[PDB]
From a paper:
We set out to design sets of interacting protein pairs for constructing reconfigurable assemblies. We instead sought to use implicit negative design by introducing three properties that collectively make self associated states unlikely to have low free energy: First, in contrast to the flexible coiled coils and helical hairpins in previous designs, we aimed for well folded individual protomers stabilized by substantial hydrophobic cores; this property limits the formation of slowly-exchanging homo-oligomers. Our implicit negative design principles enable the de novo design of heterodimer pairs for which the individual protomers are stable in solution and readily form their target heterodimeric complexes upon mixing, unlike previously designed assemblies.
We determined the crystal structures of two class one designs, LHD29 (2.2 Å) and [name]/[name] (2.6 Å) in which both protomers are fused to DHR53. To further disfavor unwanted homodimeric interactions we rigidly fused designed helical repeat proteins (DHRs) to terminal helices.
Numbering used by the authors:
A (entry chain D), B (entry chain A): 1 to 204
């Protein structure tokens, strides 16, 4: 039995940790219980082995490390220190993108997006776009529809930031391959997003 | 089993957090581990009751409630937003003063002393000094040498700030009770500071 108590955690980090724990626990076929008391998030997991619990701790560390470095950047420190913190974000986003969890891949996307928005057209912005594309490739492999909807949205940010780049070409392939998988779903909302995705690749 | 994730806290808040979890753990004789993890504190407690776990949660939530409000005080000094943060610091310090632990009481003394420093002579300082005396009274009842030393220093702070007040008379009563227990300590340094405190009680 395992329990995680999140105190003074930002909502972005909390929800990504909620989805990461719920994902890793379904892998071992275990139920998860969440409750929010006085701004404290209690995550209780039952019958979880050490291997999956250590995987929860690694993903939770990286998400909090990204949030800790984003807090320094948003404090407008020295530009030299801010650059050092953006490299910390990209380092944790790289490992978050090397994990099978959907929430970890979604965390690597949102982490690398803030680096692109912080310094557009920089060497780190290009490395951040590599992280966004690395996460979109693993996110398109996953079967869930929500993962496919984030794989297209993430790849669309690569073609928006660097149109005509080498990364944008692969991002368009990811959008096409993910939209074809979305066409398999009978739900009209999945078919709608697949058509707008196909129309975006047709427009470019 | 239980992992506490604490983010966006200073070094002083983290040190008070570690000692508080260690003290609540001895009530059940459990095992606790800490990790500093660059920007967020990780606390793992094994085989602890859910009540004790939720006592750690509310105590750590009060500590970060003080740390977050202090951050506002040190950034917009003199604003009406600072006056609101000082009332939040006192509201959390009052609840920490009711908790009968050395770390929880030290956190209430340091917090309320920060309100005395920011708003001298105001009604907030008077409410803060009452919390300092409430925590000093609980510290004197604790059977620990360092807790008795802190009760003397906290109540001596009250007589230094507003002397000849109704609170200064109550402070001298607390100083006397703590010094009477300090003289029973075999520690020579405790014997020395107990006489210095009892000498200050004869005066005023």
């Amino acid at each position: 039995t395992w329990q995680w108590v999140l105190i003074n955690i930002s909502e972005e980090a909390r929800q990504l940790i909620e989805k990461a724990v719920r994902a890793i626990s379904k892998k071992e076929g275990t139920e998860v219980h969440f409750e929010k008391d006085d701004g404290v998030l209690h995550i209780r997991v039952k019958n979880l082995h050490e291997k999956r619990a250590r995987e929860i701790h690694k993903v939770a560390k990286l998400i909090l490390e990204v949030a800790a470095a984003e807090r320094i950047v948003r404090e407008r420190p020295g530009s030299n220190l801010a650059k050092k913190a953006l490299e910390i974000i990209l380092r944790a986003a790289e490992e978050l993108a090397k994990a099978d969890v959907d929430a970890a891949l979604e965390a690597a996307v949102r982490a690398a997006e803030k680096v692109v928005r912080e310094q557009p057209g920089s060497n780190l912005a290009k490395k951040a776009l590599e992280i966004i594309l690395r996460a979109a490739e693993e996110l398109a492999k996953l079967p869930d529809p929500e993962a496919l909807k984030e794989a297209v949205k993430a790849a669309e940010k690569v073609v928006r930031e660097q149109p005509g780049s080498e990364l944008a070409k692969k991002a368009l392939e990811i959008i096409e391959r993910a939209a074809e998988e979305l066409k398999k779903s009978p739900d009209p909302e999945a078919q709608k997003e697949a058509k707008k995705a196909e129309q975006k690749v047709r427009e470019e």
